[PDB]
Amino acid sequence: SDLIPAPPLSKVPLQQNFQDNQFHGKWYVVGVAGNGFLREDKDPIKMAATIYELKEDKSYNVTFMKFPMKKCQYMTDTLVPGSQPGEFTLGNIKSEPGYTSWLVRVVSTNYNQHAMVFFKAVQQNREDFFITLYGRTKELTSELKENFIRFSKSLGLPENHIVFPVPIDQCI
Ligand SMILES: [Ca+2]
Numbered sequence: 001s002d003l004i005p006a007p008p009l010s011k012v013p014l015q016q017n018f019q020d021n022q023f024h025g026k027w028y029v030v031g032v033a034g035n036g037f038l039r040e041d042k043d044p045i046k047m048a049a050t051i052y053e054l055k056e057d058k059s060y061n062v063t064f065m066k067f068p069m070k071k072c073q074y075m076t077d078t079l080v081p082g083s084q085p086g087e088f089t090l091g092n093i094k095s096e097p098g099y100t101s102w103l104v105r106v107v108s109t110n111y112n113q114h115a116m117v118f119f120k121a122v123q124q125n126r127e128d129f130f131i132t133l134y135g136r137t138k139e140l141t142s143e144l145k146e147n148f149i150r151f152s153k154s155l156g157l158p159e160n161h162i163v164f165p166v167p168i169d170q171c172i
Contacts (some may be wrong), residue, residue: 007155008120012118013107031131033155034161037164059080060079061076067094078091093119102119103122114135133145
């Protein structure tokens with residue numbers, strides 16, 4: 001009853017010279033892909049803003065809709081500095097009563113338009129991973145979306161594990 005094994009970090013690019021002070025602010029989740037959820041027809045992933053606040057200790061406070069982003073419930077957690085700039089540990093992506101935490105690698109960004117971010121369970125026995133496509137706006141180019149499908153598939157994901165939330169539903 002297990003998941004598609006997570007890729008090694010060797011297959012995941014890291015944004016070089018990551019600028020933490022340009023990555024802060026509001027990002028929309030334009031695309032989500034992962035091994036741990038299915039493209040539900042009658043309960044779709046909602047588009048939600050994610051807020052990054054940069055702290056003086058170079059952590060971020062991050063505010064986001066709880067995964068898997070089907071209920072209009074938000075949480076705040078912390079991105080703690082990882083091995084390099086642009087890589088972090090995140091404590092939680094939802095209510096997690098088990099021994100669970102997340103490695104976060106900013107794969108690519110241009111700060112003012114798009115980002116792609118990789119997440120994988122830290123725990124040795126866990127295979128959970130996902131990728132988010134961030135937009136400063138609710139819409140991104142065909143080119144940016146196709147590149148997200150490309151990256152997502154490169155990590156073993158089939159098409160039914162890749163979703164683009166409708167840039168609508170402010171969770172009324
Ligand atoms: Ca946790």
